[PDB]
Amino acid sequence: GKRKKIRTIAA
Amino acid sequence: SLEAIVQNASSDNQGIQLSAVQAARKLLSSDRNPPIDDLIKSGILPILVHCLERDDNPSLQFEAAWALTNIASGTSEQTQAVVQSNAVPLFLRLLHSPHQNVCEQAVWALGNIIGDGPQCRDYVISLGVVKPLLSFISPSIPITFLRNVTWVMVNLCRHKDPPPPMETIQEILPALCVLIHHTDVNILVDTVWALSYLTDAGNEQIQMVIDSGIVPHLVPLLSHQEVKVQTAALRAVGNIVTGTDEQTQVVLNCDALSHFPALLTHPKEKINKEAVWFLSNITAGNQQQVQAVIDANLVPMIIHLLDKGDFGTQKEAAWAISNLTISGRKDQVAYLIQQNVIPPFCNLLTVKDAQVVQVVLDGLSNILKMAEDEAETIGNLIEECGGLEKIEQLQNHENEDIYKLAYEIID
């Protein structure tokens, strides 16, 4: 898939 | 303002400091164009990296590792800046934190760092991330965290040159064999794509995969309900069967051919193409494997795909039947010629691609050389489908081997 991911929401 | 946040992120007032780190995280996260460059330019990296080591306030640890993750998710210069701030050892330390969201954000940051390239990957590997990462493979861990862990493993395996150290690959393989027992589709897709990357390197890593005893768990995924799992498993098992005949037979002994009727007739042309590529690699093997193919009654379906399939599927089917002719018995080539093979085989003599034309020429030539006894019957069939027309027109083909082979087999 994607090699870098940005985190927008935490729970 | 982008200066107020960095000015307040160093405040000794823990409330204002955590609010400012949270605002930095928000600016780096929520939008489509995060202002990473200006934030680094204002000196937020050392502040975040030193917030990483405040075990007193784990919420601050979480928010800081979050902002660092989103900084490292950008360009290679920004990920390299995160690395230059010496945040990798602190993430490796945070892996052991008892607060699981902090420990999960550490894994996410490490994954973003590893995804940059082999340099950051080998740096994080040399500092010993593999075993602390694999210690999270347990039922206690929620499935979101385990998905992120599998994604980090994928990033660990994705780059082939230079590949990760074979010691690290040996440490990774059993973790993949454990993860392949899962039901979650994302985890399975990532695991099988990591296996596909590992099998890409050559027969050494193919044998390493086979020794893990994971083929028995990987092969049945060819019939998974989710098509993404199907294509991933097909890629992996095709990579495996590109190896030696003993490796191919190890795959076949899991009864892989049982899963291919549904693949040769799949509504997606891509799965058709990949399945015929797999079966073409199978036909190039020993005659035992050719007979195993014929036993599963897959020959008629690959003929049908050669006939009425898309272009790439047709190329793969020509390859399959031609490898069959090269390494097949006279009776098996007769079985082929019996099932309406030559009429749909000869319609690809007109395509622009030269390799397909070369392959069909060699296939027809080798079936005629294999059956010179009763070739008089076979040659007349070509006239029905207008194949002799395209052969004598190929006599005028530009490259030499095609035309000389047409002349050579006109007999």
Numbering used by the authors:
A (entry chain B): 81 to 91
B (entry chain A): 72 to 482
How does the study describe this entry?
The henipavirus matrix protein (M), which drives viral assembly and budding of the virion, also performs non-structural functions as a type I interferon antagonist. Based on the NiV and HeV M X-ray crystal structures and cell-based assays, M possesses a putative monopartite nuclear localization signal (NLS) (residues 82KRKKIR87; NLS1 HeV), positioned on an exposed flexible loop and typical of how many NLSs bind importin alpha (IMPα), and a putative bipartite NLS (244RR-10X-KRK258; NLS2 HeV), positioned within an α-helix that is far less typical. In this pathway, proteins generally display a classical NLS consisting of either one (monopartite) or two (bipartite) clusters of basic residues that bind with high affinity to the acidic pockets on the concave surface of the adaptor protein IMPα. These binding sites on IMPα are denoted the major site, located within armadillo repeat motifs (ARMS) 2–4, and the minor site, located within ARMS 7–8.
The asymmetric unit was comprised of a single complex of the M NLS1 bound to IMPα3, and the M NLS1 was bound in the major binding site of IMPα3 in a similar fashion to IMPα2. In this structure, HeV M 84KKIR87 occupied the P2–P5 sites of IMPα3, formed 14 hydrogen bonds, 1 salt bridge, 99 non-bonded contacts, and exhibited a buried surface area of 812 Å2. Similar to the IMPα2 interface, K84 also formed interactions at the IMPα3 P2 site, involving Gly145, Thr150, and Asp187. The minor binding site of IMPα2 was also occupied by electron density that corresponds to HeV M NLS1 residues 81GKRK84; however, the binding of excess peptide in the minor site is a common and well-described phenomenon in the literature. Moreover, this binding was not observed in the IMPα3 structure (see below). Since the residues bound at the HeV NLS were identical in the NiV sequence, we did not solve the structure of the NiV NLS1 bound to IMPα.
